[model samples]
Target: TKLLVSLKVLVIQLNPQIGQVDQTIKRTWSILDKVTKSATYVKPDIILFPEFALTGYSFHARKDILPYVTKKDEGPSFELAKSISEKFQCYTIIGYPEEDDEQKLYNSALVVNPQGGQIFNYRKTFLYDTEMNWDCEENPEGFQTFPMDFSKCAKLSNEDSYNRDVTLKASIGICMDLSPYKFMAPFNHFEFSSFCVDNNVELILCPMAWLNSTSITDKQTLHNNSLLEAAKNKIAFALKEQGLPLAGSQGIYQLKIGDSQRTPRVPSDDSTSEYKDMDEPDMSNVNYWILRFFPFLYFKLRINWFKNSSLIESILGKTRMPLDHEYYKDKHKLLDSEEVIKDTVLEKTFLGTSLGQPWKFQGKNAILVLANRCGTEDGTTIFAGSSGIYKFNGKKSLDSLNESVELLGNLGKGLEGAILREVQFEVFR
Candidate 1:
């Protein structure tokens, strides 16, 4: 028997207010109501809310945001999410600052199944400095991948097609984890790629609170850029498509980078190199304060020159998570010598792999999401939303076969409500 299943996935990008848990939850439900209504009543099988969608990311202290944190089963957000899932009879994935019974905190995404059960709860693997300091407690589980059945949705798509064994493997990554190149060890090719390859993941659900870089803010550089920083996830996709190896030492460290695959390190003169953590310098000095006022000099001398190297060591030191020095060295050295190794990871991983066309995954269909929440910590900058949904055609990547892709949403919004987009795909069994 042959069955055809059509699944619709939705991604919602909205501006969630910080410090207002009650209001944010209300606002979220309102958006959900609007989306399902606006889409001709086509319910989404999966709905994704942006990172920190429940609690905004600006809270700078743990105590300030602690009241917003709760277990997925115990909070107003979870309850609302449960209600939405049951009402729609679909899975819902939303973000929040989660606190366990042990009182440990995490930047988390919770998936509520149609039956109102919390089937999946993922912590943020790559915590931003602000989160580590004031909000999200550290965790080691966010980077992992898992499998879920999309067969139910598949079976419901049509009367003629009624197979229920279709499985959709997936993984979750917050804003920073996707960019292991920028944050973690570059050699690992970022965490998301490793997850995709190791788990053979077909779908990725990401919730992001990406900000505009200082470079993009300058008027001179404004026209030179487009696309959200959240799109850096493409870099991970590139590495995944390439089937790159994991970064070093066959242990827990290796597991964190990718999986237990034996991969050869990119050959380098610094094979035995090590990374030294630098001490933080006092920022209260009057001289340091004066330098902050000079944009050109600071960007040219400090940022552009030493952004890759350890020059900003005094200020930008290493992250809280431990790193294998050898992995760190290989990552840095590769980036410095080859622009393609660092700069073009996204290009190669995406464009190169697909040859400027849609890449196909044979026998698999995917519903993916990407969201951009505007503004920086200062609340002065306004970013245009770069959120969208992608649906995969049931064909694998083969030369000359450009798999079809359907994209939708108000991904260009700079000033308004949540952008709603839905993608429909057919699954065969």
Candidate 2:
């Protein structure tokens, strides 16, 4: 009975591998039977199986694992999947080790159409380099999502299921989605159903050998996170697998209807530790630095401004100050305010008008010495008495000061408002 146009789909969580052909087929037959019999709501359809399920992917490390190299397109396991798809009248995704027509070895998965024909073939793209290396040949061109028919769990057409919250556009994929963590993130090549969903592909079919080897706590956290990604992404994906090693490997996840984790907190000072996860410095430690130095820097800035506003404007080559004097305001004083200054605009340079992204002004001749603490669109900054110095004149011309700004800015940030750590500038002009 060659599959005759069934309108349904199935996803398998299977374990088959390089040399265990008979057992894998027997297990798959059982799984297919279980799904086909129960899906009476609609016609039984596509089922997926994981790669290397016949013989475990003796992946990257130990190459001496299995030697049963089957000629792909002609392997017994490959033909078995084709036969099952035809006999069951449903599509089947077969993950296997294949020696290609050219006898090049590779890890491959094929989509066997209901008509018993191999429709699509995908060679594993991302090869893992640990444990045992079975991927003898790299499929330079790999991975794809195919439009597929979805199975209805209840007696209904698309119109009827819409009311029951059962809508699905279907697509199929393999274990490559779960291999690389970066792939699951932004701008990666294979996001499995993530990229597929963007292309309007839903109903993710993941055939996997889900090896669970994590601490109980971490496993539980990951399980919950997986559910979160699946639900948040609005896709129905079934992780079909054979076994998850128990005791140290069993993981169960629980999630509420719609919940989001708390915001990620930033680290404070060294008390928070430089290279550890989740250790936070006391907020009081942070507040103390801000409280200690805000006023001294502010007064110095105002006095510097009032004394040389005209000359500063001339050297800066702008009609008015380039920096927002307002955002600069009350940063010196503790003010409870939530008002927007309408005339205010963003300035990358000092005094709202300087030539570069950062403009430094070093007072020449020891005229009026002052320090500055500024905030830029990039981040908040605190410069102490010796901060934000611009060399205005003398043997050390403005050209030297130009390069000095960025170098000094970084050093100043390290010292910030610390008593012993001071970034003092000698006035050049």
Candidate 3:
């Protein structure tokens, strides 16, 4: 049976600074109150908060963060999630540091149903480098999926009243789980995304503290520009000593003219021009998220049929093929003969794979909701604030990628409040 499941999702992007968990929770409640009372207010079926949404991310050691760690159902984070879920009569997912009975700590996310009951709890499978400092344990079970019945959470639309029991397969991953195992594994591993595809998960919820590529403050931006200038000068000095001209003609003339005669293209130490541009969305981080989920977004299945179908078929066959197998030879021969399937095939053939359309998934698409924090933490690390909900309709040609990805907030600004959007997808039982 096929059923249409519609969900109104609310993504919260807030700055939860370290040592201020209480204040952050209070602020979050206020934001929720404001959102619900707004003119365009709609009751969200699911509300999502970023990883460690109550407590901050960066911690030096286990003892340092132990005070804020709570059991799966017991912490301030859980209490807040429960309260919000009960108040809105919706499902609530919030991330926090979890402490087990054995005193082991893990980065985790908990899901609370509309009745204020804990429905699911997911321990982050892949731990980031910063998490290692706090001695956070990885989830032994890895990625997991749970069935969510939308019929209980929200009312079915008139068109889909026939099938009332709409249950969607959903999964959760914290910050770094989107990347390959510790980022040391091969890029094609697709550890987390592949798990979702294999399970046929319809909804993917990722709570992240992913950082922005651009600096947040004027001081940080100037410092970065200075560092780049120093590196450029070091390379230019090495080339001059080796009697080799610079790569670019303009760069060669600048190096030959010396520091005194050359024009100053780099920003000055006191410049705030770069920081002024921080108001815009961090598209680089957003693009990186799409790239990380390439397998889930672009591929219909785990296998790369476009390029390696023949190789896969040969491997699956009963007859053993050697290194000089005719199948392998023919595969390359086909590519060589067909000009359209050459090295630039993806560029020439794929409709949405262009540089200008980085947001386009252009393949088997599912609903992916990313709730990432905003604001600077630990006085330096700036989390990307563009929390968004994306739905890939499995279409070959999508006019606008922006229509699929609904960006919630911008960068550098502190706590732009919560963004609410609705998404509908089909589920088969």
Better of 1 and 3 by lDDT: 3
* Residue 401 in model 2: lDDT: 18
lDDT of 1 at 10: 61
Q: What is the lDDT of residue 20 in candidate 2?
A: 52
lDDT of 3 by residue, 55-128 (tens): 88888888889999999999799899999998998889999999999999889999999899999999988788
Summarize candidate 1's per-residue lDDT along 1-429 as a digit string, tens digits: 334555566666556566556766665666666654552446567777778776667676788888788887778778877988888887788888888888888888888887899988888766665675664554453366767666454555446554455667778778766655335464323245434433345677878776532212343332333444433344334323434321100111000011122112122223111111111111111111112111101111233233343332322222323464223433342334544433223222211111121221334455556665533332223333345554444332111111233333324322224443333455444
Clashing pairs in 3: none
Superposed on all Cα atoms, the candidates' RMSDs to the truth, in angstroms, are 18.6, 26.5, 14.9
- The best-first sequence of candidates by lDDT reads 3, 1, 2
After TM-score superposition, the amount by which residue 364's alpha carbon in candidate 3 deviates from its true location, in angstroms, is: 5.7
CA lDDT, candidate 2, residue 309: 51
Off by over 4 Å in 3: 152-163, 215-279, 298-365, 397-414
Model 2 C-alpha lDDT per residue in residues 78-137, reported as the tens digit of each score: 688778777867667766666656756766677776688776676654443321254365
